[PDB]
């Protein structure tokens, strides 16, 4: 068992070295691969502060895609702009089985557009709120995919910075696809932007400290807790109350949590960065070798050989049954170009 795991370690190193070579080629040579009237717009699948994600159908091929539309006017704040450029450049350069695939991107007088593969199974968020909580084996299957995805991203010096169930789509085989790279960033050491979602912020973000990829491992602790409990560990009506709970250094667990699960979570939800799993000498291996993951075949997960806990129902291509409904708003393109210079690189 010991020598089997060591060889497994060298093989991870070999994989990550090749993956970095592939990434850098695309990172250095990143535009304008389609236009808006190539697609019929079908239905809004999600909405946020700066725009929306729509199901669209490519007129020529009939293929279905998820199109993220950002209103250039709404993207007005300094870090809102920089973050939009991070998202496009990162998504065009990465390649991993649990990351959504960007197909096209382009811009017009009014909007920016990113067209991605359509993942019809819905958000983990919906499924979790409907059933209440996932059993520990079910949660562990999803957690393992996030562990591998962060091992890949962090090896490329990428921090993700917005892990939560709303951003995890379930595909036709029951596996995860991470989307929304709007907060992802290439970071060789520390970074300083105060950003993310309140319930999932690490203490060092809240305290205005320069921070690193360990914030993603904290957020993994929040996600695993929420998957297994049905609610996150720092839970309050207003963001300021959430922040006080996060910095306190206290977490309480449901009585149905296994002791192995609580042990893992105490080491992920660790305020002391010299002690937080994922941030120590042995890096991600302290997580992958934890007892709660003892039954996890990491290679089998990567190769998608493990039977998923459930498969969402699908009625055909373009089926939107696994998504919630949103108010529809007309997509209007102005006669005058807006913010041409701020988004030159896009």
């Amino acid at each position: 068992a010991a020598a089997k795991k060591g060889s497994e370690q060298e093989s991870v190193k070999e994989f990550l070295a090749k993956a970095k070579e592939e990434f850098l080629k695309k990172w250095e040579s990143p535009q304008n691969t389609a236009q808006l009237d190539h697609f019929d717009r079908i239905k809004t699948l999600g909405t946020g502060s700066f725009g929306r994600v729509m199901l669209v159908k490519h007129k020529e091929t009939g293929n279905h895609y998820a199109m993220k539309i950002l209103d250039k006017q709404k993207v007005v704040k300094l870090k809102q702009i920089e973050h939009t450029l991070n998202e496009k450049r990162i998504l065009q350069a990465v390649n991993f089985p649990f990351l959504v695939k960007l197909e096209f991107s382009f811009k017009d007088n009014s909007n920016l557009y990113m067209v991605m593969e359509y993942v019809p199974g819905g958000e983990m968020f919906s499924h979790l709120r409907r059933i209440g909580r996932f059993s520990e084996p079910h949660a562990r299957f999803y957690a393992a995919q996030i562990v591998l995805t962060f091992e890949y991203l962090h090896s490329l010096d990428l921090i993700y910075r917005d892990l939560k169930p709303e951003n995890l789509l379930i595909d036709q085989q029951g596996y995860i696809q991470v989307t929304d790279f709007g907060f992802a960033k290439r970071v060789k050491g520390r970074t300083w932007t105060l950003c993310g979602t309140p319930e999932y912020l690490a203490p060092e973000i809240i305290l205005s400290k320069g921070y690193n990829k360990a914030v993603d491992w904290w957020a993994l602790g929040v996600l695993i807790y929420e998957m297994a409990a049905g609610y996150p560990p720092f839970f309050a009506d207003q963001p300021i109350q959430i922040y006080e709970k996060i910095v306190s250094g206290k977490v309480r667990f449901p009585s149905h949590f296994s002791s192995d699960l609580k042990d893992l979570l105490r080491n992920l939800l660790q305020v002391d960065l010299t002690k937080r799993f994922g941030n120590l000498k042995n890096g991600v291996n302290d997580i992958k070798n934890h007892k709660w993951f003892a039954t996890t075949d990491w290679i089998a997960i990567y190769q998608r050989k493990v039977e998923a806990p459930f498969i969402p129902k699908f009625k055909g291509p373009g089926d939107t049954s696994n998504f919630d409904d949103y108010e529809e708003e007309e997509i209007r393109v102005s006669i005058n170009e807006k913010c041409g210079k701020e988004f030159t690189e896009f």
Binding site: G48, K164, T197, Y231, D237
Partner: peptide, 13 residues
């Protein structure tokens, strides 16, 4: 008692 619906991320706050 906490937030049960979808949660918006904050870009600078």
């Amino acid at each position: 008692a906490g937030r049960t619906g979808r949660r918006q991320a904050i870009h600078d706050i």
